[PDB]
Amino acid sequence: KVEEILEKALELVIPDEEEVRKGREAEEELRRRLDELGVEYVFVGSYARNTWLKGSLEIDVFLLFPEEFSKEELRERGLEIGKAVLDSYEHPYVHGVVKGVEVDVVPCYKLKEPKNIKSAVDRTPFHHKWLEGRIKGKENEVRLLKGFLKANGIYGAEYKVRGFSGYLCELLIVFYGSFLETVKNARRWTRRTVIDVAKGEVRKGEEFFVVDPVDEKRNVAANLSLDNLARFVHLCREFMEAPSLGFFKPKHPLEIEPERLRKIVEERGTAVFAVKFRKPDIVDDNLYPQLERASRKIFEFLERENFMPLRSAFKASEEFCYLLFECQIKEISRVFRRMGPQFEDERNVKKFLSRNRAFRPFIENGRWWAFEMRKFTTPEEGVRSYASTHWHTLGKNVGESIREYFEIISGEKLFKEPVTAELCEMMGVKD
Ligand SMILES: Nc1ccn([C@@H]2O[C@H](COP(=O)(O)OP(=O)(O)OP(=O)(O)O)[C@@H](O)[C@H]2O)c(=O)n1
Ligand SMILES: [Mg+2]
Numbered sequence: 001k002v003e004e005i006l007e008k009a010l011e012l013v014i015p016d017e018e019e020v021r022k023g024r025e026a027e028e029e030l031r032r033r034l035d036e037l038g039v040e041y042v043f044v045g046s047y048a049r050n051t052w053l054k055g056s057l058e059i060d061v062f063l064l065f066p067e068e069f070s071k072e073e074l075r076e077r078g079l080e081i082g083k084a085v086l087d088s089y090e091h092p093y094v095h096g097v098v099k100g101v102e103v104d105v106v107p108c109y110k111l112k113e114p115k116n117i118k119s120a121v122d123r124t125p126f127h128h129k130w131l132e133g134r135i136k137g138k139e140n141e142v143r144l145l146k147g148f149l150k151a152n153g154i155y156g157a158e159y160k161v162r163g164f165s166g167y168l169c170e171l172l173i174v175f176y177g178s179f180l181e182t183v184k185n186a187r188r189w190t191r192r193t194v195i196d197v198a199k200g201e202v203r204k205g206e207e208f209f210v211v212d213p214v215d216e217k218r219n220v221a222a223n224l225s226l227d228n229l230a231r232f233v234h235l236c237r238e239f240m241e242a243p244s245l246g247f248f249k250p251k252h253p254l255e256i257e258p259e260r261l262r263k264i265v266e267e268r269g270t271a272v273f274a275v276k277f278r279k280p281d282i283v284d285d286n287l288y289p290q291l292e293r294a295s296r297k298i299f300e301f302l303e304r305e306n307f308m309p310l311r312s313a314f315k316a317s318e319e320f321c322y323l324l325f326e327c328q329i330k331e332i333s334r335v336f337r338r339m340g341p342q343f344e345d346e347r348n349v350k351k352f353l354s355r356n357r358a359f360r361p362f363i364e365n366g367r368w369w370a371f372e373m374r375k376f377t378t379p380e381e382g383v384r385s386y387a388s389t390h391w392h393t394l395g396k397n398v399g400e401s402i403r404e405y406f407e408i409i410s411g412e413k414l415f416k417e418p419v420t421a422e423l424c425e426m427m428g429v430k431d
């Protein structure tokens with residue numbers, strides 16, 4: 001059964017004649033442009049090992065340079081070989097297109113093996129060398145892994161996904177031999193599982209760690225979040241229990257009507273709202289970590305102010321960002337208890353009592369307390385206040401945007417914004 005499912009899964013993960021066509025054209029051409037210049041380079045991507053997922057074609061070329069320091073020559077070479085170009089940020093590289101195919105031209109040292117100068121980009125060539133000879137023949141196993149992860153939103157080590165990188169997928173296929181064996185054993189991974197590829201061993205450690213065979217101190221699964229690891233383990237246990245081709249297919253967007261959402265929310269009886277603001281002009285890897293931090297600070301504020309947040313989420317559209325929240329408390333009393341000093345402190349007590357208040361302070365369990373008034377009674381009002389004077393804690397660029405402008409939105413108005421998918425997921429809505 002399973003083998004039959006994996007067989008049909010291949011038709012979803014293995015590229016196609018018309019994209020294996022573009023990659024074969026752009027490659028020859030790129031070599032021609034690189035050779036004429038007499039450049040030293042090496043293709044090192046998923047493309048270079050035919051392990052790239054269907055529809056995800058892209059080429060990675062690393063230019064090799066000695067022991068000198070400013071490879072602004074790369075800026076030069078790339079621009080001179082790529083039909084179109086862009087500078088993506090020791091991180092600046094050329095990204096463009098050649099014969100229609102996306103290409104990355106990156107600056108590294110033709111290092112006579114492991115040492116890596118201010119390593120990062122310099123490791124990429126060894127990663128390729130280490131894999132090239134071990135992955136041969138299992139290309140499609142890698143593809144099944146990638147396709148499986150992707151269909152479930154966990155392929156990609158970028159901050160927006162915090163999932164499994166392509167490289168991590170190839171080390172795993174190499175360690176276990178195949179996609180199936182990988183999932184079968186991933187059913188027993190724990191948050192303390194250490195997969196040491198170079199030593200062919202699995203042990204227990206401090207956190208989930210997949211030792212890079214090229215550099216033992218590096219955790220290849222550094223960006224995989226604890227929760228996406230958990231989801232993969234659970235997915236594996238589910239697939240083996242009942243394999244289905246559906247695990248290799250994107251789930252379909254819960255086409256939900258605003259009136260059905262209003263009904264779910266009034267039925268849950270919670271306060272559902274979002275903070276809307278202009279999306280700052282920064283790259284995803286910079287934006288997402290700020291959206292996560294801004295969402296956590298606001299959640300912590302809601303917890304502290306006793307609005308009992310249930311869950312939060314965020315969304316980045318083309319022009320705006322949204323921080324979504326759901327709280328168990330829609331309204332809290334205007335009066336609250338303010339803690340005073342122990343009865344023994346004559347001086348501080350006199351001070352605590354000198355303040356004018358609508359009600360009389362009192363002693364309880366040896367300490368003075370006073371009833372005082374809150375400056376807001378709903379989580380929406382609480383957040384309007386917080387976002388107005390504590391935007392500095394919400395990330396450098398996200399906070400600056402909120403400082404210029406933001407609005408708290410709820411109800412139908414909220415349902416009209418492009419955040420319905422996030423809302424449904426946040427509340428666990430099902431079809
Ligand atoms: N040690 C490294 C460092 C970087 N890359 C590059 O980092 C990006 C991740 O790619 P890879 O790990 O090869 O997998 P994907 O490119 O995601 O492959 P696919 O989209 O086809 O699934 C790629 O452009 C790849 O060229 C790599 O392969 N190995
Ligand atoms: Mg690639």
Ligand SMILES: [Mg+2]
Nearest residue numbers: 058059060104
């Ligand atoms: Mg790339």
